Design a protein around this ligand. Sequence first.
Ligand SMILES: Cc1ncc(COP(=O)(O)O)c(CN)c1O
Ligand code: NA
Ligand code: NA
Ligand code: NA
Length: 371
Amino acid sequence: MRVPYSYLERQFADIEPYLNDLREFIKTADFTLGAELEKFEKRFAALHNAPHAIGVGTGTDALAMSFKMLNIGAGDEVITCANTFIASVGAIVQAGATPVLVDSENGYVIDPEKIEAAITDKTKAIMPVHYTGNIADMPALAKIAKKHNLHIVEDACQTILGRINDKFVGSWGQFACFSLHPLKNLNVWSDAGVIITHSDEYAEKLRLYRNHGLINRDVCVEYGINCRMDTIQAVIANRLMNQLETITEKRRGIAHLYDQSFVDLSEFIDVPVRREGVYHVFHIYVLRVKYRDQLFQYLKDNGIEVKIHYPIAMHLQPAAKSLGYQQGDFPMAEKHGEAVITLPAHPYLTEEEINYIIKKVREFYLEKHYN
Ligand SMILES: Cc1ncc(COP(=O)(O)O)c(CN)c1O
Ligand code: NA
Ligand code: NA
Ligand code: NA
C-alpha cells in the first residue's frame, strides 16, 4: 500500500462545483478586494468569535504587518520559540525586529517558564506559536505579558479553529495570524494570510496598509504595501470552509486513535500530553520516537509518506548564525530534531490506510526492525 501525505488530489477531486463557482465569479470581474473577500472575512472572523478578519497576502506577511501596526521594528526584540517553522522567525526579521528564542515544552509549544529569563529592555512582544495545531499556554503567557507590559501576537498559522475552552485563538494577542496556503485544514489554491483582531482601529489601519495606504483611488493617507488576499481565492475558501469544522474534528479523531494505538509502546513512542481544555487542531501529527531515522526509512519502504517537521532547529539554521546561539541552548528543540516523525493523519485517509499506518508503526518496534 502507498499512503499519501498530501490529500489535495482527493480533496479537490470533486472539482466541477469549484469551477462552476469560478465560471460565475469571472463574469463579475471582481478581482481586487471584492465582495467575495468581504464575505470570506466575515465568516472567518465569526469562526473565532472575533469582530474583524483582514485577508492579506500570506501568513508570514500577516505576522510582519501585525508588528508594523504595533510599531515593533528596528531596535526591538520579539520573543518566540526555537521550535517552529522558519516563517515564524522570518516574520520578525521582516518587520526589522530582533528575534529572541526560548525552548519548547512537552507539546511542541513555547515553554512559559522560560520566557521571563529572555526578557530585556528591548523586548516589545511575545509571539507564541500554536505549533502543530497545539495551543500555547495563553493564560500563562498573558500573565507574563501583562507583568512586563509586552504585546502579544499569536502565530496561529497552523491553527484555524484553535481554542482553549471559552476562548478562541486571538483572545489574548492584539492580533492572531493565520495561513490558507496548502496544506491547511482550510486551504485555497495559492498563498493567502488572515489577521484577526478585536481592535476597530487596528482593523481599519490594516485595511489601509494592505492596499497602498489608499483610502480611495485618489488619496494615499500613509505609505502602505500591496498585500491583500485575492478575491478569487476567497471564492475557493468560501466553498471549502463549508467542510472546515468536520475536517478539523475528524482530524482530531484520527489523532486520538493514534494516541490510543501507541499507548502501550511508551518505551519507543512518546505521545505528547494533551492539555485539558485545549482544542488542538492537529495540523500535523507529531511523535517523538526511538530509532527515528530507522523507523522513517522503514515506513517509507512500506509505502507510507512520513515526514520530519523538522530536523534542524531554528537556532541551528545557517540563517540564525548571527543570533549567537549554540547547540545545547535549547535541549527540547534539539531533541525534537533528533526524535520527531510526522504520520499522515488527514481526514481524507481511508480506514484501511489509517489501520495500515498503525500496523506498520507497531510492527517496526514489536518485530525489532531497529536491530
Ligand atoms: C508556524 C507557522 N507560522 C507561519 C507560517 C507562514 O504561513 P504562510 O506560508 O502563509 O506564509 C507557517 C506556514 N504556513 C507556519 O507553519
Ligand atoms: Na504549555
Ligand atoms: Na492540513
Ligand atoms: Na491567486
